[PDB]
């Protein structure tokens, strides 16, 4: 009977809500009210990376904090050199509409994907010199929205068929299929130890998954609309989400509930790109109001505005040493901020 | 040391990017949309994952994307198609049950914040089945405004009244709120649809240039 299962499901939901209510002895803002604010952070556009023809959906910084791959809807994956402004590589993609891109931790490969339902892995360290298709991962049903490497060997991809997938690049098939989301999974983010990963979807829910187990360990609710972006806190025990309801939301894995909401009455537009700083004190979020905002992650105060774009900011990434922030947008220009 | 070779590699990359820029700006992107029973497949196979078609009209390359590999939820990947010149919108004008679904889809496309610039080329297919349904299912049951509607096809004018009522409903949604709508009446066997796409895209890029050089 579906009615008794519905009753058991709402009883379990009430039990989880009561456990989170009894666990909420205080808030992060009440604890951090005694510490000093971070002031005003005036990040300037130190470099502008131009050369894309269509709008950008994804970037990913390299682990050397110098090179970044960027994905644009002309079918272009450009790997840049942010120190010297030059383009290291320019990959012409098979499908024009690319929605995600990744840069490997070793740096040898990049990934892309989008409406072609396929994660394309490109080798940047070929013996000939030119960049070819290393692997063509097919098996997803919906559009590929986020993919991030674990190493040279495996990659987890989030897709629009309410599933995520851990793929083996060597054999080209899904080792693990993560199922349980209700809406289109729009972004994932790996933990620093790469043991677990969170994924935000269009069901106003973020699911914390184990990579080896494949079962959804934790489920986080509290958002009001489609979560478009997600990023772990640098310690790996918390994460922030951005969504279409103009609120960013920092949750904790151990507390298993909401910690803090990042919102303003002057903001009515959704968040497309979420990342933290090196310390995690600054949460930088790109918005649909043509700009980005640097929220205080412990005080919920908008400490800065990154207003160098005249179109939608869609991707935003922070270097692994925290040296720079690159806010790619729909102007076909990446902008390096510092 | 390695800065000079990086500079020559960057120069070669911007040369290839300039060639791709001329190729990209020469072609006009089109987003084909429709229902499952709509005749968008006959539209995309008329002048012939994503079903992509190149077709050259008057030495102008139009490249059209039929996205059928996705699910029924479309609020996120439709934002991919904002840089296209137009949204081709195929409507079953003969299927009154899902005509309101097509009207709601066109309203959501028209009022979407990232699709506010895009014009919609409206193709009302199955005009022959619409004619054989009108002369032989009443649209007044699914649309009470047809009881008070007047005409603003050659054998009988009730077909004209029905097709212009559907066109007027779509144009009422279009004009209820930078971008125009280009409704057309066409069948499955019609070779003029590429020419209609060419003329409507010519009007779209002409109005875009009229806004660009500040005449509008």
């Amino acid at each position, epitope marked *: 009977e579906l009615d008794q299962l519905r009753q058991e499901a709402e009883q379990l939901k009430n039990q989880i809500r009561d456990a989170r209510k009894a666990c909420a002895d205080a808030t992060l803002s009440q604890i951090t009210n005694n510490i000093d604010p971070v002031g005003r952070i005036q990040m300037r556009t130190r470099r502008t990376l131009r050369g894309h023809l269509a709008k950008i959906y994804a970037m990913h910084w390299g682990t050397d904090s110098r090179l970044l791959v960027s994905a644009s809807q002309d079918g272009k994956l450009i790997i840049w050199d942010s120190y010297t402004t030059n383009k290291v590589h320019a990959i012409p993609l098979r499908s024009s509409w690319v929605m995600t891109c990744a840069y490997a931790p070793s740096g040898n490969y990049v990934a892309c994907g989008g409406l072609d339902n396929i994660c394309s892995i490109y080798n940047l360290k070929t013996r000939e010199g030119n960049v070819r298709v290393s692997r063509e991962l097919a098996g997803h049903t919906g559009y590929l929205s986020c993919c991030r490497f674990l190493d040279d060997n495996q990659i987890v991809t989030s897709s629009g068929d309410t599933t995520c997938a851990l793929w083996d690049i060597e054999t080209g098939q899904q080792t693990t299929t993560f199922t349980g989301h209700t809406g289109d999974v729009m972004s994932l983010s790996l933990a620093p130890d790469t043991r677990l990963f969170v994924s935000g979807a269009c069901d*106003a*829910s973020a699911k914390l998954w184990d990579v080896r187990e494949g079962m959804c360990r934790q489920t986080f*609710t509290g958002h*009001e609309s489609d979560i478009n972006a997600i990023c772990f806190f640098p310690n790996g025990n918390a994460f922030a989400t951005g969504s279409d309801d103009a609120t960013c939301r920092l949750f904790d894995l151990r507390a298993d509930q909401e910690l803090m909401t990042y919102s303003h009455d002057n903001i009515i537009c959704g968040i497309t790109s979420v990342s933290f700083s090196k310390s995690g004190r600054l949460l930088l979020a790109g918005y649909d109001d043509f700009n980005c905002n640097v929220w205080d992650a412990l005080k919920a105060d908008r400490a800065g505005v990154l207003a160098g774009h005249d179109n939608r900011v869609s991707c935003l990434g922070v270097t692994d040493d925290g040296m720079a922030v690159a806010t790619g947008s729909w102007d076909s220009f990446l902008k390096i901020w510092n | 040391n390695e800065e000079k070779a990086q500079r020559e590699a960057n120069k070669k990359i911007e040369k290839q990017l300039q060639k791709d820029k001329q190729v990209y700006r020469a072609t006009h992107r089109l987003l084909l949309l429709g229902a499952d029973n709509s005749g968008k497949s006959t539209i995309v196979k008329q002048m012939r994952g994503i079903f992509e078609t190149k077709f050259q009209v008057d030495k102008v390359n139009f490249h059209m994307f039929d996205v059928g590999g996705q699910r*029924d939820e479309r609020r996120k990947w*439709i934002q991919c198609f904002n840089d296209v010149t137009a949204i081709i919108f195929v409507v079953d004008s003969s299927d009154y049950n899902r005509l309101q679904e097509a009207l709601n889809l066109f*309203k959501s496309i028209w009022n*979407n914040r990232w699709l506010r610039t895009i014009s919609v080329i409206l193709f009302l297919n199955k005009q022959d089945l619409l004619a054989e349904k009108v002369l032989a299912s009443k649209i007044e049951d699914y649309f*009470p405004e047809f009881a008070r509607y007047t005409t603003p096809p050659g054998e009988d004018p009730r077909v004209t009244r029905a097709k212009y009522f559907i066109r007027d409903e779509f144009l009422r949604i279009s004009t209820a709120s930078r971008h125009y709508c280009y409704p057309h009446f066409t069948c499955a066997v019609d070779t003029e649809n590429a020419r209609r796409i060419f003329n409507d895209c010519r009007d779209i890029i002409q109005r875009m240039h009229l806004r660009q050089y500040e005449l509008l």
Partner: nanobody, 126 residues
Framework: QVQLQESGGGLVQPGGSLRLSCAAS????????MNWVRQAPGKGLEWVSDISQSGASISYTGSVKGRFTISRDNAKNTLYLQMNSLKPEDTAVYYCARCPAPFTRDCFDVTSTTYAYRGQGTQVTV
């Protein structure tokens, strides 16, 4: 959590009246354009009506115009659908949909088979 509980559905004679009340929790009602959709047995999801954020823009499907009305109340955070003169073709299960993004007058995916911001529905039968 975005939760939508519908109530008021049940057996009703043709030509009668029926009130559906949906209680909304987990989101602010005043920012979302709230829809009522339905699914007939052996049929797909059919959109019935929608009401805007302030209640000024109210629209219906053509088979329910003059018979159904849709209202919202932001004070007690709920949605109403009142049905007068029920045809026997109006038998369905009624879901209360929701606009996926706030402050937008476009409603994508409200009639999807696996839409997230939608209730479990109430069975309205003749």
């Amino acid at each position: 959590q975005v939760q939508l509980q519908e109530s008021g559905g049940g057996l009703v004679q043709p030509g009668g009246s029926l009130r559906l009340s949906c209680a909304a929790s987990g989101f602010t009602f005043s920012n979302y354009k709230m829809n009522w959709v339905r699914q007939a047995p052996g049929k797909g999801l059919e959109w019935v009506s929608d009401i805007s954020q302030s209640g000024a823009s109210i629209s219906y499907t053509g088979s329910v115009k003059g018979r159904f009305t849709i209202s919202r109340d932001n004070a007690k955070n709920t949605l109403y659908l009142q049905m007068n003169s029920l045809k026997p073709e109006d038998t369905a299960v009624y879901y209360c949909a929701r606009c996926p993004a706030p402050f937008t007058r476009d409603c994508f995916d409200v009639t999807s088979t696996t839409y997230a911001y939608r209730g479990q529905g109430t069975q309205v039968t003749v």
